[PDB]
Design a protein around this nucleic acid. Sequence first.
RNA 1: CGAGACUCUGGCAUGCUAACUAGUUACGCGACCCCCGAGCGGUCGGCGUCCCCCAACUUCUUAGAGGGACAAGUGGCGUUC
RNA 2: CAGACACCAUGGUGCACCUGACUCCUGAGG
Lengths: 313, 126, 56, 191, 70
Amino acid sequence: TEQMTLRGTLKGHNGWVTQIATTPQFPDMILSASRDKTIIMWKLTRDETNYGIPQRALRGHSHFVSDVVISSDGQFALSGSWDGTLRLWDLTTGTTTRRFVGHTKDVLSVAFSSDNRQIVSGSRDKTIKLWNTLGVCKYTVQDESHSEWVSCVRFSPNSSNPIIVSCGWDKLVKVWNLANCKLKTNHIGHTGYLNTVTVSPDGSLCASGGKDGQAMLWDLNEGKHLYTLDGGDIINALCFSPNRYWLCAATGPSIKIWDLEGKIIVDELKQEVISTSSKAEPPQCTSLAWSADGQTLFAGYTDNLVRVWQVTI
Amino acid sequence: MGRVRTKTVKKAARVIIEKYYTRLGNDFHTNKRVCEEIAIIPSKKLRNKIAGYVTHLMKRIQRGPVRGISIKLQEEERERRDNYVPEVSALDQEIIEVDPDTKEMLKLLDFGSLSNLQVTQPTVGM
Amino acid sequence: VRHVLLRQGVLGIKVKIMLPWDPSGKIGPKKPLPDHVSIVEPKDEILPTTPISEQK
Amino acid sequence: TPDIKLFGKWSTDDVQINDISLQDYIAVKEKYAKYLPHSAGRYAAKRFRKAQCPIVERLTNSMMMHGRNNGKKLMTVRIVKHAFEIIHLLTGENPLQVLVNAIINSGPREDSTRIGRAGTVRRQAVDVSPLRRVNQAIWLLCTGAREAAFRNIKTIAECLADELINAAKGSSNSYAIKKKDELERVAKSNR
Amino acid sequence: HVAQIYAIRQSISKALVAYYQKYVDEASKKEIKDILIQYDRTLLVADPRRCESKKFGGPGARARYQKSYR
RNA sequence: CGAGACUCUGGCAUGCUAACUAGUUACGCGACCCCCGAGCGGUCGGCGUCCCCCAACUUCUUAGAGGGACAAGUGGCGUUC
RNA sequence: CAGACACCAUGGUGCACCUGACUCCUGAGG
């Protein structure tokens, strides 16, 4: 099995890089949300004095941008932010098309469909909302929509069927069928507040994990529990590979990357370092996203650098 | 110098840490929101001081239990860990040198052992 | 304050009552007390059940 | 302009510090070159802050003293710019180099601090910090220029120029030099 | 007059950078931010200092009337 | 109990919601039109008045709800408190 | 510990005060 070597490092953020997102059309784009109240669009010159140079800054919020997502073409950006709004920008220029107002409290998560017309958001006002690109709120899915905050909302590939999978701090995962907003299946069996959930790239499986550090593998086509894969430390972000069944989990002391077919541990990439204090000593990796083509793996770190690896045998 | 924490903050912090250990993070911003959910605090400055101290506590706590505070789950873990067995009790230690009067204590209990004799350089231990 | 007129002077009666309502009734004057904080209870983040899910 | 930031009609180049103990409180190009002095009009915000302020800016600030002249920086900047021109005619050179030399020669080495000794008038010989030596020098020179101007035809600009040149290479017609010799002499003596 | 001078300088440099940040390119705006921030003049960050309130019993804000003592 | 905490004011919100007893932007800008400069000139830029919209905005101006500071992040020190 | 160590006097008055029995009494009804 293969391994990851450090292709380069991306620079040039203030505050933690909370999210990263790629677009299919440009694997040379990387959109990144950071704690600086701005989302920065980078053009990757794939380089070794850097790894890119910032293309645009999409300016301004009153509080940190927690999550971001791009179009399938990567011409528009949808950001969710803790100033209680979501903003639709034109990624390649500026100018907000719309400001989506309908939350009175923090918007943790934003996600976008592959048809680019369903936009779903999760919030700490304990709602899952379905929105149009015109700022028109189609649905406000409450009731059986977590007892607690909505940490993340993800879109399953919609050309199978339009399904969203949400994770909440009530230690449950709820799978919804959109266009009727009713539960396909409630996944019960988790421990601890769920930080993240991720869909497989054909929507067949689902990997969910949180505080417990246990990534649990579910069949998202029947709503049944496959098995559990052991971590042992809080998982901040999960992401399946687009061209493989490799799950990468950003844990507290290390990014643990595993192969889910066959089952083995591909690598454990350290990020711990001599700087003993020792209660303020670790960074943890808060995000990771696989590239379009799955050659590259970008991870967003709380040390303000996105570290890129390219797979070598 | 100024604006050292008051009792009101610290009490609340102890409370929160014990009963919401798994929910709590280590990041100010998220903890600040958690304090809104799990309590009614009538000022933001007060809530910020509470939240703030609770992160500082969580950081210390996740190295095992620390001074003046303990969480129930960690107490159970230490209890189980300490099953420690340092003898089994006598080693056995039979038939070794003993003090000449400790010897007569064994002797008149139907045992006896080998025993030390003679006095050289008193005072003893000096 | 009330002035009670006496045949040798005036005496001052001052009555000051502190209401039993500040975080209740419903709620009383200017928020809960500024040095007091009330929690809920947890009773979550545990299960003995093994992971299983079923269609809804 | 970004290659070297000059003064507003003189150069910041060729300014040399002729002492090794007064370094890092004498500067004009060691980052601190300015066409026009002004930082933000606070200099008492940090104890760190004094290092930021170069000798030129400190000299403009110290000048505005005595009630009518207080809090008029614009008047002082005009007077100071004129003063530099007067120095340049009188000695050629660069006026800033003349200024630097004047500070070094006027700054004391040893001074005295009070110490008890029977209740009789005795004092302890002590060296003073280079920050203090620069601060005191700038004070002396400004006070000298103002003192002359007060009941004489010459303006503050002219008297300041005269005061710097006399101190730069000794003449014993500069107030700052005369005061320094008294402070160092007394220091050496004492108990 | 002075208040305005400082304000204008801050707005013009910020202006240039702002225009390049959304429309032209980041490298230009970033280059300008580098050059300014180093010698520094607070042209991209706000000054906190605004007038402090006057309190009674003095002729000034912190200045106070002369006392007299036997 | 006092003080702290607390409240009020000053500062940080090109985020949020608004404004014809408030303004700004932004055209189309024409006129008063001066050529001051560019352009042969129409036209473009221009202090103000005047053209005004089914224009756009809240930046300056206003006042409402919101967030930001908690020694938070990191590194030394301390009974590691 | 292990640097320096001085003169300086004088001055008047009163009231500090002592016992127990919960209603705004409700007052349409009561």
